[PDB]
Amino acid sequence: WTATSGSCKGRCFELQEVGPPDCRCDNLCKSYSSCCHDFDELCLKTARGWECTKDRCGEVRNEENACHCSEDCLSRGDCCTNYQVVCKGESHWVDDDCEEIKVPECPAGFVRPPLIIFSVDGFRASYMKKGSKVMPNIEKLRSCGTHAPYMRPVYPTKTFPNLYTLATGLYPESHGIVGNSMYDPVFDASFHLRGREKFNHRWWGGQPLWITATKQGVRAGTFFWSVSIPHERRILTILQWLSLPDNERPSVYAFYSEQPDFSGHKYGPFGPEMTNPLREIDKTVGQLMDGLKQLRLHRCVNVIFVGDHGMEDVTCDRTEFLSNYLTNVDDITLVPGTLGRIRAKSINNSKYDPKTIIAALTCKKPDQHFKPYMKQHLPKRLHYANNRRIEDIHLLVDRRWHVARKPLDVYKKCFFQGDHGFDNKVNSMQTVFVGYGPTFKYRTKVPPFENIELYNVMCDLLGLKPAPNNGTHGSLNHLLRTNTFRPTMPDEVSRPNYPGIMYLQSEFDLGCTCDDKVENKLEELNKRLHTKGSTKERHLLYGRPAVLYRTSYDILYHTDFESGYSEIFLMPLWTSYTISKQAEVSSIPEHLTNCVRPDVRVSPGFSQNCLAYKNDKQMSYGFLFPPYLSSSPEAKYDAFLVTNMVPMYPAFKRVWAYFQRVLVKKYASERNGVNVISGPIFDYNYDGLRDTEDEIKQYVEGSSIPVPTHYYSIITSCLDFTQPADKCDGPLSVSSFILPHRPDNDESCNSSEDESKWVEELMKMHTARVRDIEHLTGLDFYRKTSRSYSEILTLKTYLHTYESEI
Ligand SMILES: *[C@@H]1O[C@H](CO)[C@@H](O[C@@H]2O[C@H](CO)[C@@H](O[C@@H]3O[C@H](CO[C@H]4O[C@H](CO)[C@@H](O)[C@H](O[C@H]5O[C@H](CO)[C@@H](O)[C@H](O)[C@@H]5O[C@H]5O[C@H](CO)[C@@H](O)[C@H](O)[C@@H]5O)[C@@H]4O)[C@@H](O)[C@H](O[C@H]4O[C@H](CO)[C@@H](O)[C@H](O)[C@@H]4O[C@H]4O[C@H](CO)[C@@H](O)[C@H](O)[C@@H]4O)[C@@H]3O)[C@H](O)[C@H]2NC(C)=O)[C@H](O)[C@H]1NC(C)=O
Ligand SMILES: O=C(NCC1(O)CCN(C(=O)OCc2ccc(OC(F)(F)F)c(F)c2)CC1)c1ccc2[nH]nnc2c1
Ligand SMILES: [Ca+2]
Ligand SMILES: [Ca+2]
Ligand SMILES: [Cl-]
Ligand SMILES: [K+]
Ligand code: NA
Ligand SMILES: [Zn+2]
């Protein structure tokens, strides 16, 4: 209950929300049904429209008008945004030649350039090009400021997870808004789009820009607007705020548009009805920019034009029904649509089995338009698992489709022709970024980047220190003229050992054998040099990875590869090798098929053994440097050392062998040599971070050999492919993956076919940033290049997506 019998006189869009039950006048009061009786009368004037006509010029101030054309309006701060154009012979902002903004040009009393965030819902990336004819204002920002061809949203590509990711720099799994609709088992509460529960602060984790700004003494406009408040009024409210006295004037603001998402849902992303919403949003940008010009703020304010996600073509007839797969369909709750999340309808039903449910949804129909996963098996790039609000069972839906429980759900809710929410690598889901002002660069194109990175930059722009978040601070310095953040490389925490030959073959008792008994001076001197690292500049191109946690490991050098071998985990943390364009693929000789060789540099106590693999009927093993890419028959013996061995399910060796025997060569061929760093990942608690040893849930039977949840590779080469990988002068090029180490290939529906038909597709699905791998390994890569650190950070956030062009 609100005692709504107070007043909004002189309080319209107050910046400090008042406490119940005195009535409110803030831009959110409508949503709380708590505005004063006179809020509409006083704060939402509409009289005479939003534009000055030639005959309103010089007029006498009539307070009933929505905006003014009187002589005193400039200094009252409440002219219609086009006042100067109509009444003072000024030009619109969009008609003006664009001019570099080298320094902020601000009125006396402005301590910093204000930031204005102009956020647009459902603004698909290709709109910039495709709708350019009807968006002159937006096109001017884009082409005159700093722009990316697109920005990558987070998964799910839904509204709240993405807006709250912009605001916080955090993955939805960390911020808590993991969908538009959520159930939290601990609260025993439900969050929905429509309703009051979403206003409860317990849903919202992390620290959004407005709170960061506030705590650090930077005043913020209130970010959120009630639906009923028309765009024109929001714009005027922002401009009014910017005329306030210095001590009361906020430094950061947000505008939000419900369009083009609203129409996109009805009409599809490119429906002819979409031209009008795009014109309208442009008109609004024009109003903003014209109003900034009027206040002499158009060369002072940094403006960000940013979308939450794109829009895809989706119709009712493209719906998969869980009733066609499950007979038990009433015992489950489905969160539906462009993603699927499944839980038990009742906690008291012990006839519920996720295992049998996944199986009943796995590869059942030839053209199946979703794939079920246990959340921990989702591609690690989605970072979508570490929250009690994310159900164990998840369905990734093909672009253009929906998933629903029963057909009755669809027709007793075709209405819609567009939707969004799919995998964040999907082209149709990509969105927009433009930065324009003194702090952003002039006429500059930057590569696509992830929306998780912007929070850092908005802090940079405002002189704020960002709260801990998922961006890599410095990775977007290239967007900025100044205000850059100069990061320093994290310090190495563990230094390696360099073991020499310390053990005799007979001290090992590992149950391993090798037919290596078939045994010069020119070449004994030679292989000695190889074990001291004579070829190390070839195979270790960027320096060694730094270990950022306390542990015990050995650098091991070889002719063809170098490794950092962990005495704690009994396997390398990383194995680094270079494969030039000219390299030859050989087979494993017949005699050496089961060959494993004790490593005379490493104690038996800190080694794996063959016996455990023999006894473990589930687990086989593979190698990190592949025997197939050995440089010579004699170097091949090195690839079979017990210290190059890692545990692998037979089902995964199919994947791994095909990568090593076929794809490394192809990449060397296509990219003019590659440098490969490969290794194991342990993430049993699926938090995207390196497990400590006491977190491993699985060992090779009867041993302390820990089983990875995943295997990674970072594959680097020269961005200028006319230069070989091992002699690159300039910028680098990288693609990486984090393949799940699974006992079956259920994920890949074509897996009973030859590896050339499915392995690569699986790998592409599990593409990753080097930065994802760093989090999962406590390693820091690219420590020694000739490249600047900021450029290396960008490189480390790059994701190779395998989508066609935008
Ligand atoms: C992306 O970036 C983010 C941001 O940096 C990364 O997330 C951080 O990671 C840290 C490491 O995991 C983690 O640090 C821990 O802090 C714990 C206290 O955290 C509270 O306070 C902070 C600060 O204000 C707050 O942000 C937290 O908010 C969480 O929880 C609320 C509700 O309670 C949510 O609303 C909110 O969304 C957020 O939830 C998310 O994080 C939690 C983890 O806290 C997840 O569980 C959720 O699923 C959700 O995703 C908290 O209110 C602190 O308790 C930890 O300390 C333990 O471990 C240390 C080791 O240093 C040890 O010294 C202690 O003994 C202690 O262990 C004790 O508890 C154990 C478990 O109960 C128990 O087994 C032991 O016996 C001990 O008693 C730890 O230091 C930090 O909280 C999060 N921050 C955020 C915002 O998410 C994220 O890693 C990045 N992701 C990637 C892939 O890089
Ligand atoms: O609009 C929808 N629902 C209503 C809504 O809550 C109204 C209030 N609101 C707002 O005014 O937000 C400003 C803002 C702008 C930017 C930010 O972040 C920042 F600042 F970082 F950009 C930031 F946190 C906040 C957000 C949207 C909606 C849309 C499309 C859909 N499709 N399917 N379902 C859907 C539901
Ligand atoms: Ca949205
Ligand atoms: Ca972990
Ligand atoms: Cl959702
Ligand atoms: K075995
Ligand atoms: Na299969
Ligand atoms: Zn939408």
PDB file of N, CA, C and O in Angstrom, residues 119-149:
ATOM      1  N   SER A 119      20.572   1.848 -25.487  1.00  0.00           N
ATOM      2  CA  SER A 119      20.404   0.423 -25.693  1.00  0.00           C
ATOM      3  C   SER A 119      19.124   0.067 -26.437  1.00  0.00           C
ATOM      4  O   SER A 119      18.042   0.565 -26.113  1.00  0.00           O
ATOM      5  N   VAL A 120      19.274  -0.797 -27.440  1.00  0.00           N
ATOM      6  CA  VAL A 120      18.169  -1.180 -28.322  1.00  0.00           C
ATOM      7  C   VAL A 120      17.961  -2.677 -28.308  1.00  0.00           C
ATOM      8  O   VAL A 120      18.871  -3.457 -28.576  1.00  0.00           O
ATOM      9  N   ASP A 121      16.741  -3.073 -28.019  1.00  0.00           N
ATOM     10  CA  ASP A 121      16.377  -4.461 -27.907  1.00  0.00           C
ATOM     11  C   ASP A 121      16.199  -5.149 -29.283  1.00  0.00           C
ATOM     12  O   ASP A 121      15.482  -4.650 -30.146  1.00  0.00           O
ATOM     13  N   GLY A 122      16.830  -6.301 -29.492  1.00  0.00           N
ATOM     14  CA  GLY A 122      16.647  -7.073 -30.737  1.00  0.00           C
ATOM     15  C   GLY A 122      17.301  -6.500 -31.992  1.00  0.00           C
ATOM     16  O   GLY A 122      16.962  -6.896 -33.129  1.00  0.00           O
ATOM     17  N   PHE A 123      18.261  -5.598 -31.804  1.00  0.00           N
ATOM     18  CA  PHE A 123      18.907  -4.961 -32.908  1.00  0.00           C
ATOM     19  C   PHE A 123      19.997  -5.883 -33.486  1.00  0.00           C
ATOM     20  O   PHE A 123      21.192  -5.817 -33.113  1.00  0.00           O
ATOM     21  N   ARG A 124      19.561  -6.744 -34.392  1.00  0.00           N
ATOM     22  CA  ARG A 124      20.439  -7.645 -35.148  1.00  0.00           C
ATOM     23  C   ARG A 124      21.588  -6.911 -35.838  1.00  0.00           C
ATOM     24  O   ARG A 124      21.390  -5.844 -36.384  1.00  0.00           O
ATOM     25  N   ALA A 125      22.769  -7.522 -35.832  1.00  0.00           N
ATOM     26  CA  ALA A 125      23.973  -6.875 -36.330  1.00  0.00           C
ATOM     27  C   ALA A 125      23.876  -6.398 -37.788  1.00  0.00           C
ATOM     28  O   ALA A 125      24.320  -5.280 -38.090  1.00  0.00           O
ATOM     29  N   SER A 126      23.310  -7.220 -38.666  1.00  0.00           N
ATOM     30  CA  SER A 126      23.188  -6.891 -40.102  1.00  0.00           C
ATOM     31  C   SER A 126      22.243  -5.710 -40.394  1.00  0.00           C
ATOM     32  O   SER A 126      22.239  -5.176 -41.517  1.00  0.00           O
ATOM     33  N   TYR A 127      21.464  -5.286 -39.395  1.00  0.00           N
ATOM     34  CA  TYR A 127      20.663  -4.068 -39.542  1.00  0.00           C
ATOM     35  C   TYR A 127      21.519  -2.871 -39.903  1.00  0.00           C
ATOM     36  O   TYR A 127      21.032  -1.985 -40.615  1.00  0.00           O
ATOM     37  N   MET A 128      22.783  -2.844 -39.441  1.00  0.00           N
ATOM     38  CA  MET A 128      23.628  -1.680 -39.686  1.00  0.00           C
ATOM     39  C   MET A 128      23.779  -1.466 -41.179  1.00  0.00           C
ATOM     40  O   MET A 128      23.593  -0.350 -41.665  1.00  0.00           O
ATOM     41  N   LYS A 129      23.992  -2.558 -41.909  1.00  0.00           N
ATOM     42  CA  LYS A 129      24.181  -2.493 -43.354  1.00  0.00           C
ATOM     43  C   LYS A 129      22.836  -2.476 -44.076  1.00  0.00           C
ATOM     44  O   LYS A 129      22.552  -1.592 -44.901  1.00  0.00           O
ATOM     45  N   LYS A 130      22.014  -3.472 -43.750  1.00  0.00           N
ATOM     46  CA  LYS A 130      20.760  -3.701 -44.441  1.00  0.00           C
ATOM     47  C   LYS A 130      19.756  -2.550 -44.285  1.00  0.00           C
ATOM     48  O   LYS A 130      18.980  -2.288 -45.181  1.00  0.00           O
ATOM     49  N   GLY A 131      19.792  -1.846 -43.166  1.00  0.00           N
ATOM     50  CA  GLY A 131      18.821  -0.790 -42.921  1.00  0.00           C
ATOM     51  C   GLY A 131      19.461   0.570 -42.916  1.00  0.00           C
ATOM     52  O   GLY A 131      18.862   1.537 -42.441  1.00  0.00           O
ATOM     53  N   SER A 132      20.671   0.649 -43.465  1.00  0.00           N
ATOM     54  CA  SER A 132      21.468   1.878 -43.419  1.00  0.00           C
ATOM     55  C   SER A 132      20.792   3.070 -44.090  1.00  0.00           C
ATOM     56  O   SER A 132      21.003   4.215 -43.678  1.00  0.00           O
ATOM     57  N   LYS A 133      19.991   2.800 -45.124  1.00  0.00           N
ATOM     58  CA  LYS A 133      19.287   3.854 -45.876  1.00  0.00           C
ATOM     59  C   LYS A 133      18.263   4.606 -45.034  1.00  0.00           C
ATOM     60  O   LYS A 133      17.947   5.755 -45.314  1.00  0.00           O
ATOM     61  N   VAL A 134      17.730   3.956 -44.008  1.00  0.00           N
ATOM     62  CA  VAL A 134      16.693   4.598 -43.223  1.00  0.00           C
ATOM     63  C   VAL A 134      17.174   4.972 -41.814  1.00  0.00           C
ATOM     64  O   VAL A 134      16.381   5.379 -40.965  1.00  0.00           O
ATOM     65  N   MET A 135      18.476   4.865 -41.567  1.00  0.00           N
ATOM     66  CA  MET A 135      18.996   5.234 -40.258  1.00  0.00           C
ATOM     67  C   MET A 135      20.186   6.200 -40.367  1.00  0.00           C
ATOM     68  O   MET A 135      21.301   5.845 -39.963  1.00  0.00           O
ATOM     69  N   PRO A 136      19.950   7.425 -40.906  1.00  0.00           N
ATOM     70  CA  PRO A 136      21.066   8.363 -41.092  1.00  0.00           C
ATOM     71  C   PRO A 136      21.836   8.705 -39.796  1.00  0.00           C
ATOM     72  O   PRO A 136      23.057   8.667 -39.805  1.00  0.00           O
ATOM     73  N   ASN A 137      21.132   9.031 -38.708  1.00  0.00           N
ATOM     74  CA  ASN A 137      21.769   9.367 -37.439  1.00  0.00           C
ATOM     75  C   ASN A 137      22.688   8.244 -36.926  1.00  0.00           C
ATOM     76  O   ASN A 137      23.847   8.486 -36.547  1.00  0.00           O
ATOM     77  N   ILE A 138      22.151   7.020 -36.924  1.00  0.00           N
ATOM     78  CA  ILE A 138      22.873   5.850 -36.440  1.00  0.00           C
ATOM     79  C   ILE A 138      24.076   5.555 -37.349  1.00  0.00           C
ATOM     80  O   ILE A 138      25.172   5.222 -36.855  1.00  0.00           O
ATOM     81  N   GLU A 139      23.882   5.708 -38.664  1.00  0.00           N
ATOM     82  CA  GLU A 139      24.955   5.515 -39.640  1.00  0.00           C
ATOM     83  C   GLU A 139      26.087   6.511 -39.417  1.00  0.00           C
ATOM     84  O   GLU A 139      27.267   6.173 -39.612  1.00  0.00           O
ATOM     85  N   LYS A 140      25.733   7.740 -39.011  1.00  0.00           N
ATOM     86  CA  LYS A 140      26.742   8.771 -38.737  1.00  0.00           C
ATOM     87  C   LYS A 140      27.560   8.415 -37.491  1.00  0.00           C
ATOM     88  O   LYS A 140      28.800   8.480 -37.500  1.00  0.00           O
ATOM     89  N   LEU A 141      26.882   8.052 -36.410  1.00  0.00           N
ATOM     90  CA  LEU A 141      27.593   7.554 -35.228  1.00  0.00           C
ATOM     91  C   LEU A 141      28.566   6.432 -35.612  1.00  0.00           C
ATOM     92  O   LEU A 141      29.783   6.519 -35.346  1.00  0.00           O
ATOM     93  N   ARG A 142      28.016   5.395 -36.245  1.00  0.00           N
ATOM     94  CA  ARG A 142      28.779   4.213 -36.669  1.00  0.00           C
ATOM     95  C   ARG A 142      30.010   4.620 -37.469  1.00  0.00           C
ATOM     96  O   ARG A 142      31.112   4.203 -37.160  1.00  0.00           O
ATOM     97  N   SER A 143      29.822   5.417 -38.515  1.00  0.00           N
ATOM     98  CA  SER A 143      30.931   5.624 -39.435  1.00  0.00           C
ATOM     99  C   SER A 143      31.912   6.670 -38.905  1.00  0.00           C
ATOM    100  O   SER A 143      33.061   6.698 -39.315  1.00  0.00           O
ATOM    101  N   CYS A 144      31.452   7.542 -38.014  1.00  0.00           N
ATOM    102  CA  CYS A 144      32.315   8.598 -37.501  1.00  0.00           C
ATOM    103  C   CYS A 144      33.007   8.224 -36.207  1.00  0.00           C
ATOM    104  O   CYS A 144      34.084   8.760 -35.897  1.00  0.00           O
ATOM    105  N   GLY A 145      32.416   7.281 -35.477  1.00  0.00           N
ATOM    106  CA  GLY A 145      32.985   6.852 -34.212  1.00  0.00           C
ATOM    107  C   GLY A 145      33.786   5.579 -34.353  1.00  0.00           C
ATOM    108  O   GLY A 145      34.415   5.324 -35.395  1.00  0.00           O
ATOM    109  N   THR A 146      33.740   4.782 -33.283  1.00  0.00           N
ATOM    110  CA  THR A 146      34.354   3.471 -33.241  1.00  0.00           C
ATOM    111  C   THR A 146      33.250   2.431 -33.380  1.00  0.00           C
ATOM    112  O   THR A 146      32.250   2.483 -32.664  1.00  0.00           O
ATOM    113  N   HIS A 147      33.377   1.521 -34.333  1.00  0.00           N
ATOM    114  CA  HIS A 147      32.339   0.490 -34.476  1.00  0.00           C
ATOM    115  C   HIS A 147      32.933  -0.903 -34.700  1.00  0.00           C
ATOM    116  O   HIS A 147      34.010  -1.038 -35.277  1.00  0.00           O
ATOM    117  N   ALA A 148      32.206  -1.920 -34.252  1.00  0.00           N
ATOM    118  CA  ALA A 148      32.523  -3.308 -34.546  1.00  0.00           C
ATOM    119  C   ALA A 148      31.535  -3.852 -35.602  1.00  0.00           C
ATOM    120  O   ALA A 148      30.385  -3.412 -35.633  1.00  0.00           O
ATOM    121  N   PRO A 149      31.966  -4.788 -36.483  1.00  0.00           N
ATOM    122  CA  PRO A 149      30.971  -5.307 -37.469  1.00  0.00           C
ATOM    123  C   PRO A 149      29.823  -5.988 -36.753  1.00  0.00           C
ATOM    124  O   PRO A 149      28.706  -5.995 -37.274  1.00  0.00           O
TER     125      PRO A 149
END
